[PDB]
């Protein structure tokens, strides 16, 4: 994380609009649908046999919400992204054993969901600002793999 004043203004101004109730679920959902292997991790979530069954699962939308929190957390903590995520890293690292590349996927799908929700307002430049944050988080996450 660096995020130039311009970039920061872009990131901040966007997350401000973000529907926190439903974007996290939108992104978590899409990860399960796009990267189906990742579903081996939410077997206790219920019926995930169909993307429909995936997109309308209350657990998914319930979980997707905690996921955005951590993001809101980090988005305003670029300073110490590693500090912020120590605990989470630990959970996913030597507790969940989630391959760090999944961390990237999520990030990217989060990028698509944003792009999905903001349309034209999600310009390349804002995208790039977001690419930075997303990868910082994913890097903060797989930190405990060291």
């Amino acid at each position: 994380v660096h995020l130039t004043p311009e970039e920061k203004s872009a990131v901040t101004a966007l997350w401000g609009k973000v529907n926190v109730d439903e974007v996290g679920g939108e992104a978590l959902g899409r990860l399960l649908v796009v990267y189906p292997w990742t579903q081996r991790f939410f077997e206790s979530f219920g019926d995930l046999s169909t993307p429909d069954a995936v997109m309308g699962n209350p657990k998914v939308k319930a979980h997707g919400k905690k996921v955005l929190g951590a993001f809101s957390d980090g988005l305003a903590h670029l300073d110490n992204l590693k500090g912020t995520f120590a605990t989470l890293s630990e959970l996913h690292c030597d507790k969940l054993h989630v391959y760090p590349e999944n961390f990237r996927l999520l990030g990217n799908v989060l990028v698509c969901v944003l792009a999905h929700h903001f349309g034209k307002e999600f310009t390349p430049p804002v995208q790039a600002a977001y690419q930075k944050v997303v990868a910082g988080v994913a890097n903060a996450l797989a930190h405990k793999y060291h």
């Binding site: 796009v34 997109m55 999905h116 390349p124 995208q127 690419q131």
Partner: protein
């Protein structure tokens, strides 16, 4: 892979894309160059600036190559034969860059067709793009 279902989706979304195909392919690169600056290393003789007509005309190129894929999806290899050579042999493009490109392509798709960019369509696009990428890097393989 690419199932009768995927096949349907890809042909669907693109149907939807229409004549803005070229318009999107350029947005994609643009997005790529800004978000993944390292990729910029392949277009040193390109004006990578915002309205660059260079990037503008390349987008159509790519865009058209993707159109060729969709229509010949059941024969990508033979279809992209030439392009694999250019990219793998002649260009020696790092396979990773295809992952970055595909991403921006998706992002672009999403930013313009909120209607059709369903979770299921999203998946089929991603699958399709990976196929394209694999062939275009298949000479490495």
């Amino acid at each position: 892979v690419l199932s009768p279902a995927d096949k349907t989706n890809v042909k669907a979304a693109w149907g939807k894309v229409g004549a803005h195909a070229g318009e999107y392919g350029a947005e994609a690169l643009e997005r790529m160059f800004l978000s993944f600056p390292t990729t910029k290393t392949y277009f040193p003789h390109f004006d990578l600036s915002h309205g660059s007509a260079q990037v503008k005309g390349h987008g159509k190129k790519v865009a058209d190559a993707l159109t060729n894929a969709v229509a010949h999806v059941d024969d990508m290899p033979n279809a992209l034969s030439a392009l694999s050579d250019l990219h793998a042999h002649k260009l020696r493009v790092d396979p990773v860059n295809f992952k970055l490109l595909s991403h921006c392509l998706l992002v672009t798709l999403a930013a313009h067709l909120p209607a059709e960019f369903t979770p299921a369509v999203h998946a089929s696009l991603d699958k399709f793009l990976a196929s394209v990428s694999t062939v275009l890097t298949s000479k490495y393989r």
